[PDB]
Amino acid sequence: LWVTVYYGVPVWKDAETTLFCASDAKAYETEKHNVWATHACVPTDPNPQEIHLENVTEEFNMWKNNMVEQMHTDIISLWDQSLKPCVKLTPLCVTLQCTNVTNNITDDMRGELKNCSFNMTTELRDKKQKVYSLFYRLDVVQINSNKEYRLINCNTSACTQACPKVSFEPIPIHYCAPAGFAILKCKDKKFNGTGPCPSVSTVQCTHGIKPVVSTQLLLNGSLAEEEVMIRSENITNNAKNILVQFNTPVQINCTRPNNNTRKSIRIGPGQAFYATGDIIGDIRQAHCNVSKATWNETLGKVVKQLRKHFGNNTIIRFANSSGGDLEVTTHSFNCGGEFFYCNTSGLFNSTWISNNDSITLPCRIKQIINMWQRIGQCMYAPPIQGVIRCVSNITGLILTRDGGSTNSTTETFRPGGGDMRDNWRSELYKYKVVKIEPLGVAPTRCKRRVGFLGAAGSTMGAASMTLTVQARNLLSGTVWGIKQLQARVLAVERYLRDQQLLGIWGCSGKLICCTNVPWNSSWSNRNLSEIWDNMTWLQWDKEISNYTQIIYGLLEESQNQQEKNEQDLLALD
Amino acid sequence: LWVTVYYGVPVWKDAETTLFCASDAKAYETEKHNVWATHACVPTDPNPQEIHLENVTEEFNMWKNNMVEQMHTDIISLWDQSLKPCVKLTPLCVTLQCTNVTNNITDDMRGELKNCSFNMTTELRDKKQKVYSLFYRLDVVQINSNKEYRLINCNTSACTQACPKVSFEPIPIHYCAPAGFAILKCKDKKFNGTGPCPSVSTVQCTHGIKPVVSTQLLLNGSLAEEEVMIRSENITNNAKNILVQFNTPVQINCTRPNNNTRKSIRIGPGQAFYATGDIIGDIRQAHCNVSKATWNETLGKVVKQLRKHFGNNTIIRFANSSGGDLEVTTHSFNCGGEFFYCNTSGLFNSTWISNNDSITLPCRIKQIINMWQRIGQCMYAPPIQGVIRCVSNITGLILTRDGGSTNSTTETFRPGGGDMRDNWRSELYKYKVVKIEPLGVAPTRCKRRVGFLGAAGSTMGAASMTLTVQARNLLSGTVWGIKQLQARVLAVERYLRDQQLLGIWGCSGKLICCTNVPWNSSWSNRNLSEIWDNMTWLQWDKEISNYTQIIYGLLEESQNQQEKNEQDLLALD
Amino acid sequence: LWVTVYYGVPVWKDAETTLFCASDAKAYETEKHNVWATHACVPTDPNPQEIHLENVTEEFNMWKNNMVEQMHTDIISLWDQSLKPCVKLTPLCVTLQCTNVTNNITDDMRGELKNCSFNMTTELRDKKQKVYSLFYRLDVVQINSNKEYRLINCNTSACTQACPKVSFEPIPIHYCAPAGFAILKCKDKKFNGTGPCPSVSTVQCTHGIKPVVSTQLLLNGSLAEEEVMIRSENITNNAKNILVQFNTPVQINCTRPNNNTRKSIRIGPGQAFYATGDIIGDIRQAHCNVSKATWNETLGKVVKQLRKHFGNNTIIRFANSSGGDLEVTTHSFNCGGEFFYCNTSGLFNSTWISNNDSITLPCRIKQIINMWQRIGQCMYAPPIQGVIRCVSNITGLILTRDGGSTNSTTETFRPGGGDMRDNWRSELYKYKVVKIEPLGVAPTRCKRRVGFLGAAGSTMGAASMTLTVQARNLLSGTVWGIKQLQARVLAVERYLRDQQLLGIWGCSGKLICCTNVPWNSSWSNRNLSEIWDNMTWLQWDKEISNYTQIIYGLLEESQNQQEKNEQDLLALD
Ligand SMILES: *[C@@H]1O[C@H](CO)[C@@H](O[C@@H]2O[C@H](CO)[C@@H](O[C@@H]3O[C@H](CO)[C@@H](O)[C@H](O)[C@@H]3O)[C@H](O)[C@H]2NC(C)=O)[C@H](O)[C@H]1NC(C)=O
Ligand SMILES: *[C@@H]1O[C@H](CO)[C@@H](O[C@@H]2O[C@H](CO)[C@@H](O)[C@H](O)[C@H]2NC(C)=O)[C@H](O)[C@H]1NC(C)=O
Ligand SMILES: *[C@@H]1O[C@H](CO)[C@@H](O[C@@H]2O[C@H](CO)[C@@H](O)[C@H](O)[C@H]2NC(C)=O)[C@H](O)[C@H]1NC(C)=O
Ligand SMILES: *[C@@H]1O[C@H](CO)[C@@H](O[C@@H]2O[C@H](CO)[C@@H](O)[C@H](O)[C@H]2NC(C)=O)[C@H](O)[C@H]1NC(C)=O
Ligand SMILES: *[C@@H]1O[C@H](CO)[C@@H](O[C@@H]2O[C@H](CO)[C@@H](O)[C@H](O)[C@H]2NC(C)=O)[C@H](O)[C@H]1NC(C)=O
Ligand SMILES: *[C@@H]1O[C@H](CO)[C@@H](O[C@@H]2O[C@H](CO)[C@@H](O)[C@H](O)[C@H]2NC(C)=O)[C@H](O)[C@H]1NC(C)=O
Ligand SMILES: *[C@@H]1O[C@H](CO)[C@@H](O[C@@H]2O[C@H](CO)[C@@H](O)[C@H](O)[C@H]2NC(C)=O)[C@H](O)[C@H]1NC(C)=O
Ligand SMILES: *[C@@H]1O[C@H](CO)[C@@H](O)[C@H](O)[C@H]1NC(C)=O
Ligand SMILES: *[C@@H]1O[C@H](CO)[C@@H](O)[C@H](O)[C@H]1NC(C)=O
Ligand SMILES: *[C@@H]1O[C@H](CO)[C@@H](O)[C@H](O)[C@H]1NC(C)=O
């Protein structure tokens, strides 16, 4: 009959907000190399809390998530911030004099290293300096008695050498939302990227996400749980990348067996340039090894789950990439500072039908890079002395279907990728951000006299006793610097708005503040047995969400003001 | 009689604060390249509300407004931000060797364009490049086989090319104040600039203001109603500009018949310099057209209002600009990218005794500009390819009077301008920012036991029923980015201070409350019928403004502390 | 028996927070623009409030004061900010060719002023310029038939010319604590800098302190009272400085008799380089003067007050500095823009046994400078034309004890300094920041039915009637603005946390409230009369902070939740 206002109901709606980084601050409390990304984040909770929701079935969507875009923008801005402070190599674009290096009489790499020598400025503007350095063939381009060259990007973009002190080591970060927002987590083991997730769990924020950069194979990412899953925006469409994820890792070992040496040239006053001085001992190519039997078994599995969608009689035949830029055409990870670019033509060999030492990947290195498909600004990665070795493990792939015929007697899958959002979407697949609103109104028989969300799936009557748990922690009282400020300002304003709305009414209280506005039959007149015993809060929100504004207006104006002026006139005499 | 505290009365008072931007969704969603000003402006509400205050009369002042200065600072800051991130053109200073253009036939514009050639640097620091470009006569100065010149600014300032993609296209901007403030709006049809406006209305924020930059003639402005209103700070003083506002607009057309060509010179790495390569076909001077009959009629209408201020039978005479810099001597503006500088001696030339064709304005174009009289921050607008044409309205003038004696036989009005504040002040003449304060105290016979401003003109008895409406909107739950954040924080702060000051008294959760403070007769006591039925809250607060601190001190000391301590002593048994 | 929560109670504890500047408007209104970026600082309070606290004893310490480090960081940041828009002199690193003092007659100083002639780029790229300048012997280092030199730091740092408009003139800076905090001012006459101060006071803003710079002598410092004070972290440790603060000042006059003239050389466009053109008249030595009798008397006082720690009849000896950099070896300072560097060996040249016109100190001047022992950043102070004279007051030394022994026979003292924290620490020795904690709990017999800090020393019974004054003040109503914004948001967040924590309990009504938690005897049981009337509020915080968290837990969980769970039954009707 009479309206009653409830504060702290289990209700949420989809929204987007400014997330802030959290990371393990104890590891870097003792200072180390100034990492590219992870600094100034709030310390992470030593005991993260994950709460399971009893009966809810939330709808997820991988390919229209906003956290991926926020992550990509954050990484781009962090990289741009990192590159700015240190040296600019504007005076290095000069005509070079380059000849082939003479290794320690070992062949098959003779044409790849140059010994460019050139003129460079010095401290005093009136004088010039004569220097030399070693450049890779992919870094230096010809300009048309030994022939003379220039750097590759002199006619496109400038160069800012990376600050030698920082380190491009990926290390995990946690994206945490402001107070008043919650991040759901799809939990079932067969989530194909879209559709309902019958198992859901609320977490304050995420686990450790390593911002690894790669094009053709995903490295160090999170594995699947039950089986190797295949995800795509629309599998039937050939234009959409077919992300894949493994359940057991395939180990890849990469090396640069050259005893490189750094050599600093001054281009001062103050500024210095680090050249590739000289290589000691033999010179050999950089190669990556992947176990043959393990890779064969992994592909023989992926083809098995891949035939679930494309029929169980078709012929599946992998192949190397079609072509394009060197980033797209070759697996382009980074290992300790050097930016490899490796072939992968030996991996994607097979032709499957219904019925042992290693695989070597010969490859090459480039020092100058302009990643994220950008133009107008490049970077010069300084050389790293000594042999460098990495042991990653392949966790997923990025496939693309040819779709070259309509009969569909066979299918051909060439690996691709290069849009860095695909790497992030492979990790943020089981998250979304929701906006908790704690206020609610429902009819009852009042007349006023003169887990964190574990009750979400329960009926409205069952959830009418746990109101306090929602409202207890509603406030929870340079990149990563302004984001925290905006996040906490938004949280404070949300708490203040909720308190003001609950205060202008007659309630000023937490649990079950009865009111006096009569229940109009126009606001979905149902039997109270059909309301309290049948429905739940999330369902109760939807049909009445049109009329919440009218009920708020009636409570604030029609009832409280008249009631209080009546009390004031009562105390007159 | 005892004091009673009301929260959310219609009281306001004049104040100055920080405003933020807001733009239309159409301009917000324009996929093309960003406009010079609006990038992070929040989208505007599709339906702003007008809450005409009914019986209120407020004192307006056009000249001493603070919105104008804030707009000027914001515009200058936006320009400086716009020019920072693209090409700097320091190495263009070279001794240029120039020669006249050959024209086509029947030479008429010989001395304006020069065919300058100079040696310019290329990407490779070793080599040099021979190029040529066409510079207008106003952009070069001779130095002492053919003659040689330098650029205009290479002994005062360093050039900086305007970014080639961004366009200085004026578009509407709305300046909206944060929560807890209001922007009143005068609507008197004959508002001359100062004095009380008997018809006052409040909007959430202003109408669309086009930030057009021009001098000597206001373009694309807002027109008056029923009269050709004329405004000035002081008509007797001859050192003050006399703004005008036409009833109906005057159509002005402008053209640049030369068919330019954009020649790209690469002076990298990365940078570039766009040059006026060569002109195709016939070559002629830029000119602007204004209808003769319309302009004659408009002058004949404006002189009638000048006769009112300066008396009947006085002869009003017009004359062209007094002389000085080219910025103020000629009607300067930009039409699609080219900065025109048009002679206006054909318009301001007439004499008016007591009792079909088109006018052609010769015009000249300049490329190197240092607008806003800020020497040291020059700019080089790149050439715009193809014929340029635009059609605009003239909706105002900026006249100045001649002060040679008075002996009022006649007056001589000469156009002026140059200070850009007058362009903004012509649009923001019907607004001012007033901060709303909700708290208030008034007497009555009660003692305690032991539209958004539509009621601003109503009596205190009727106004006390609308405390909810006033009290609701006190939170409303790059340069613009920090403006919005600071304004939001300020609003939250003011609301929290109001809440705390209400809470130290015994009236925390209530809009109205009775208190046991006696009403001292020294506070201008009056019969209740003369307060609650013969006064309004704005008029009441104007009377008790001296005793507010004493009453607040009494309420916080004599009542709450003593009451709580005595109640604590009572609860012991 | 029962617990009762008190809000707004005079209790504080040590804490650190970012402070904000406050300077008078006259400094900005001075014609010398941007002397210290006064626009950043807030206008000063016209009447700072000092409230005497009558019974409080507080533990002071200056050797761990955080305000010293905050002032140092603020000064460094302001200095770096000031020079950013100024000219950069990278093209000045040229092979100079210098030949002593050929243009003038000089006394026996001989080769201190080098007459340097060298090439330079004119306002145009094409043509070079032949110019000259006078550089001091300290500003040029030889490089290997007239000899040739270069500037001192052409292989270390890039000079940036000081802007000529601004001047490095110190002005008062007032430090004001943000909302919620307070600054305690110790007023004891004989305060050593450590231990309990029995005459504490409080101030909203500190007294005006001038950020002077000088190594071996403190200039314009604040004077002590009634005796020369000696302060040290541990006097018997040889490695720690021993500050001194004279009772009465010793005046020092300094002069630059050379009559310099400024020559403006153009490095255009938009850049100028001010050289030392020529010296009119005879070359003469720069020197400083100190009164002999006054200085001898001051050292006679310092020995009297410094033998107190060491011995009544121990030999104490003074001596000049040992060696090292010119900054530490010699008393440096600025005198009207010229950075003097004067040896003080004519002053510390005394020996004192167990039981006549003026001291003159000739000294040098250096132009290129980089204070704080910084590397990578430098400045070139332009010449100050005309004869220069200064007058200053010495107000404290910075001594240092030698580690040799002679365990008791003799003690040797030398001037020290070099780190600029000591100069700030000599002025902020009587101020520390404290954080106010307004919540408090005390036992009493109440059971619930089913100046700003002048009372900090008074008993709890009397201090319960002044809860309003503390509670009222807690809220207190581009680059470098985010610091103030973050401090402000932090204050708001702290207030909201306190209010929410009070709201979880059954005490939404502010100030003295009562709760039903019994008072366990284990929590420092005392008879009630000796709790309320034989003890103060600060001492109560020193005997509950162990159990305060558990008391808050009992209040928030054990009583209010059960009360609501009992109330829900009666809420149905
Ligand atoms: C006053 O407002 C008028 C709006 O009518 C301004 O004229 C407009 O100027 C723009 C920019 O030149 C014109 O758009 C351009 O059109 C050309 C094609 O001619 C196109 O190639 C460009 O990319 C751009 O879209 C626009 O057509 C023109 N308006 C009209 C009706 O022609 C005028 O510039 C304003 N006054 C001042 C002083 O800015
Ligand atoms: C997924 O992509 C496929 C493209 O193959 C879409 O299927 C096409 O739909 C159009 C429109 O009806 C037909 O003309 C084509 O013949 C279809 N192609 C095939 C191979 O069947 C499909 O609609 C897309 N799915 C979604 C949900 O967008
Ligand atoms: C990729 O696959 C092709 C065939 O699919 C491989 O070519 C085979 O090489 C072996 C070894 O000489 C021959 O015995 C076969 O006859 C070849 N097959 C065909 C169809 O000609 C090729 O070597 C593979 N390359 C890599 C790098 O894995
Ligand atoms: C200044 O004199 C005081 C004694 O009056 C010394 O301070 C004492 O220091 C000890 C050591 O920490 C403390 O336990 C005492 O409480 C302090 N008492 C007082 C009154 O401050 C201090 O050491 C002297 N300073 C110097 C530099 O010698
Ligand atoms: C102050 O400094 C002195 C000297 O540095 C310290 O005294 C020394 O203490 C060690 C440890 O017992 C002895 O081995 C030395 O012989 C002492 N030297 C002298 C000269 O006394 C003293 O401990 C320091 N005091 C404080 C409070 O730090
Ligand atoms: C610093 O200079 C001042 C003058 O500007 C000196 O003060 C003067 O000294 C002379 C000689 O003793 C007196 O005749 C004047 O009356 C003094 N003038 C004033 C205003 O006091 C001062 O002695 C100099 N100090 C030093 C250390 O040389
Ligand atoms: C400051 O003055 C003293 C005293 O004149 C200078 O000390 C000289 O030191 C050198 C090296 O031992 C010797 O010439 C003498 O011992 C001292 N000179 C005289 C005349 O006795 C000191 O060099 C001066 N400071 C500077 C930076 O030169
Ligand atoms: C505008 O009108 C007011 C009267 O309301 C008058 O005081 C003022 O001088 C007028 N100003 C002008 C410029 O006409
Ligand atoms: C007293 O109140 C009456 C209301 O009926 C009013 O008419 C009268 O003017 C008042 N007199 C004074 C002195 O305020
Ligand atoms: C400059 O003066 C110094 C000091 O007397 C002297 O050693 C030097 O030889 C002089 N320079 C020349 C060029 O004579």
Numbering used by the authors:
A (entry chain B), B (entry chain A), C (entry chain C): 34 to 141, 150 to 185, 187 to 309, 312 to 321, 321A, 322 to 398, 411 to 505, 521 to 547, ...
Publication text:
HIV-1 Env trimers of most primary isolates prefer to adopt a metastable closed, pre-fusion conformation and transition, either spontaneously or in response to CD4 binding, to downstream conformations. Subsequent engagement of the Env-CD4 complex with the CCR5 or CXCR4 coreceptor moves the Envs down the energy gradient on the entry pathway, culminating in the formation of a gp41 six-helix bundle that facilitates the fusion of viral and cellular membranes. HIV-1 envelope glycoproteins (Envs) of most primary HIV-1 strains exist in closed conformation and infrequently sample open states, limiting access to internal epitopes.
Both the 1059- and BG505-SOSIP trimers were purified using Galanthus nivalis lectin (GNL) chromatography, which exploits lectin binding to Env surface glycans in a conformation-independent manner, followed by size-exclusion chromatography (SEC). We obtained cryo-EM reconstructions of unliganded 1059-SOSIP, resolved at 3.6 Å with 737,588 particles, and of BG505-SOSIP resolved at 3.7 Å with 975,399 particles. To assess variability in the datasets, we further classified each particle stack into 10 sub-classes. Within these 10 subclasses, we observed a larger range of protomer motion in 1059-SOSIP compared with the limited range of motion observed in BG505-SOSIP. In comparison, and consistent with the lower range of protomer motion observed for BG505-SOSIP, the 3D variability analysis of BG505-SOSIP, revealed no significant opening motions of the SOSIP trimer. We analyzed symmetry of only two SOSIPs purified via GNL under identical conditions; we expect that analysis of SOSIP Envs of additional HIV-1 strains, which are planned for future studies, will reveal a range of asymmetries that may relate to the ability of different Envs to “breathe”.
